[PDB]
Design a protein around this ligand. Structure first.
Ligand SMILES: CCCCCC(=O)O
Length: 133
């Protein structure tokens, strides 16, 4: 079910990431740096457990989860959130909840590229990742 998402992915395009970060309350200096990094996202499975790593020159994160089972997460911008990841329409949908707010991180494969759509408030960011061999 998740298998076409698995592997190593590199950022090759980003639209509206500053809007998304600003909506989350990320400070201007962090937004500066993050507007110029190109993270690598590694998605691996072991049985029912998925691990999603995001690596860059600035920030690194790692989460492990089972689809459909809530987990605690501390995000790159230090939000302590309640998270759940599921498949919906073939998309990997990651919902974070904190302080009554929500954000969604939706990953879709389109013509072999991984398109990550980040929504918080009215801000909608689209980031495109291409697979590494
Ligand atoms: C606040 C976290 C943002 C993650 C952006 C990305 O994985 O490209």
């Amino acid at each position: 079910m998740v298998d076409a998402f698995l592997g190593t992915w590199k950022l090759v395009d980003s639209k509206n990431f500053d809007d998304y970060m600003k909506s989350l309350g990320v400070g201007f200096a962090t937004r500066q740096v993050a507007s110029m990094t190109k993270p690598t996202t590694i998605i691996e499975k072991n049985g029912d457990i998925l691990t999603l790593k995001t690596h860059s020159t600035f920030k690194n994160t790692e989460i492990s989860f089972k689809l459909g089972v809530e987990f605690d997460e501390t995000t790159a911008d230090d939000r302590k959130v309640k998270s759940i990841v599921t498949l919906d329409g073939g998309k990997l949908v990651h919902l974070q909840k904190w302080d009554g707010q929500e954000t969604t991180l939706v990953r879709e494969l389109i013509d072999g590229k991984l398109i990550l759509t980040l929504t918080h408030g009215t801000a909608v960011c689209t980031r495109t990742y291409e697979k590494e061999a």
